[PDB]
Amino acid sequence: MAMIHKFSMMGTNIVVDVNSGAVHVVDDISFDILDYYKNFTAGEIKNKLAHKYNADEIDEALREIESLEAEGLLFSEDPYKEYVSSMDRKSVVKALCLHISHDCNLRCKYCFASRNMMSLEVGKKAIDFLISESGNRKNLEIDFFGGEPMMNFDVVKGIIEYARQKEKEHNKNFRFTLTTNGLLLNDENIKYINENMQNIVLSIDGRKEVNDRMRIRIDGSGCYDDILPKFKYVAESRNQDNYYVRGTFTRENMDFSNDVLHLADEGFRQISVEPVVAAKDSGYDLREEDLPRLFEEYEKLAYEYVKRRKEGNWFNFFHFMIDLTQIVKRLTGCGSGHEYLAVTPEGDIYPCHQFVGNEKFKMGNVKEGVLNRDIQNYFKNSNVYTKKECDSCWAKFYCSGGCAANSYNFHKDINTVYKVGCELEKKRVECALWIKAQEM
Amino acid sequence: MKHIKILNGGC
Ligand SMILES: C[S@@+](CC[C@H](N)C(=O)[O-])C[C@H]1O[C@@H](n2cnc3c(N)ncnc32)[C@H](O)[C@@H]1O
Ligand code: SF4
Ligand code: SF4
Ligand code: SF4
Ligand SMILES: [Ca+2]
Ligand SMILES: [Ca+2]
Numbered sequence A: 001m002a003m004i005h006k007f008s009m010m011g012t013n014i015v016v017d018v019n020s021g022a023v024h025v026v027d028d029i030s031f032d033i034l035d036y037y038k039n040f041t042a043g044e045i046k047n048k049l050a051h052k053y054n055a056d057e058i059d060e061a062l063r064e065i066e067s068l069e070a071e072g073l074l075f076s077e078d079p080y081k082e083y084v085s086s087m088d089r090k091s092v093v094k095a096l097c098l099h100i101s102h103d104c105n106l107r108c109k110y111c112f113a114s115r116n117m118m119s120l121e122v123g124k125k126a127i128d129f130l131i132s133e134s135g136n137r138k139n140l141e142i143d144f145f146g147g148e149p150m151m152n153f154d155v156v157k158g159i160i161e162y163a164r165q166k167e168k169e170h171n172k173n174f175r176f177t178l179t180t181n182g183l184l185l186n187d188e189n190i191k192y193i194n195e196n197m198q199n200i201v202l203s204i205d206g207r208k209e210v211n212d213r214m215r216i217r218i219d220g221s222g223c224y225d226d227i228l229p230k231f232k233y234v235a236e237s238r239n240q241d242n243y244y245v246r247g248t249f250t251r252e253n254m255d256f257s258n259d260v261l262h263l264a265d266e267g268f269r270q271i272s273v274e275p276v277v278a279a280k281d282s283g284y285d286l287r288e289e290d291l292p293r294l295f296e297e298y299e300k301l302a303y304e305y306v307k308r309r310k311e312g313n314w315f316n317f318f319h320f321m322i323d324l325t326q327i328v329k330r331l332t333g334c335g336s337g338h339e340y341l342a343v344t345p346e347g348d349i350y351p352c353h354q355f356v357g358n359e360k361f362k363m364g365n366v367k368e369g370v371l372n373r374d375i376q377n378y379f380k381n382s383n384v385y386t387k388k389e390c391d392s393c394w395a396k397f398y399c400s401g402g403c404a405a406n407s408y409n410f411h412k413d414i415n416t417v418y419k420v421g422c423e424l425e426k427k428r429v430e431c432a433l434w435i436k437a438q439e440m
Numbered sequence B: 001m002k003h004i005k006i007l008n009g010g011c
Helices: A027-034 A042-048 A054-072 A120-133 A150-170 A187-196 A209-216 A224-238 A255-264 A288-313 A373-380 A404-411 A419-438
Strands: A005-010 A014-017 A023-027 A095-101 A139-146 A171-181 A198-202 A243-249 A270-275 A339-342 A349-350 B004-006
Touching: A005 A419, A014 A027, A014 A419, A023 A150, A023 A419, A027 A054, A027 B004, A042 A054, A054 B004, A095 A120, A120 A139, A120 A150, A120 A339, A139 A150, A150 A171, A150 A187, A187 A224, A198 A224, A209 A224, A209 A243, A224 A243, A243 A255, A255 A270, A288 A419
Parallel strands: A095 A139, A095 A339, A139 A171, A171 A198, A198 A243, A243 A270
Antiparallel strands: A005 A014, A014 A023, A023 B004, A339 A349
């Protein structure tokens, strides 16, 4: 139903009209009137606020409010509501996350990796599986993943050449991503990477002490000193574009603005630092008690974010990027289990890398190419329009849709929202909105 | 307006 969200952040009052995507910057009196506008008449509102605002200035702000509602920018209704009643939608797989190896040279503690190389034959099966399951979609994505993919880099190159040849016959266009811990980068494979990887993700958690506390070799020592210069080299050889450094923050580093700003101070223009996934009973998960400190941390990062963009020493922070010009997105989410699937070196298919450890979620194996459609449709139909909690949530059209892995990890049910996750996600959106308001 | 100002007119 019709719904707004309003918040006040660092002095700016912001109003979100949920169904239309309209976003407004309002003065204090409008902010206060909005507490009452739907359930009270103009006369009752004038009496309820008369201790603070005179009747003329209230009617003035009032005359602006229903003018905005008359044109669909406040308390608008949902135009996509009637259409969504579809559950027979054939899913189209658009991307595969290839676990190129389950071995690694680190024992990062928050990681699912804490085994086998994928054969070129399995990788070729994964390509052919993605072509037959992508239907008539030309643009396909392959993320080279796993434990550490560069420990099986020859198979990565054969997969690319294989897929690059299948493009002509099937009118496909593959875009390849590589995510690496960096330990095995060098001049020669970075040259290949800049010729062939449309995107590369470089894993580093921020300050050296934060990074080397979590991202640990089998002997127990840190990796910051080794990977940092390699990452700056990669960043600069790609003109500070088409990459990002990717950190994970846990309960151990809740002052994570310090880590984002450390990566910024080291020259990285493209940064993503994200909360740990599936960390139940780990000692790491952010808890409900931690939300006030994390909220203040996002706000202090946003303020500094605006300041550096104003002064010119800019950097991009993935969770602050947002498009204020926008049904397909509201039904898909991250796509795990239906549009986005992970493949093990053995070739087994899972919804995403966070489910690979659980055969209850195995959906088939690419060497045969026969996907369990019931699991695919179950993940497909678990989305923002079908979860009851999302239906009353103001961020439903801005959020990334939730994380099935978190949901299963904390409630053993992909359809139950992970509350800590939602509140962090809603606060991030609030910050991204305040940033847009600061840069009118 | 005067009291309102319209702003828009991982894995
Ligand atoms: C799983 S690793 C595999 C690819 C490669 N070995 C690397 O580290 O970049 C890819 C990324 O996922 C992140 N990651 C691992 N476990 C995570 C978790 N539990 N929650 C959030 N991110 C995680 C890692 O920090 C890394 O940035
Ligand atoms: S994060 Fe990448 S590097 Fe660290 S353990 Fe998991 S897979 Fe290996
Ligand atoms: S934030 Fe959580 S609750 Fe709100 S829509 Fe996204 S997933 Fe659903
Ligand atoms: S389910 Fe969670 S972890 Fe898996 S792809 Fe989606 S967002 Fe990533
Ligand atoms: Ca506030
Ligand atoms: Ca004020």
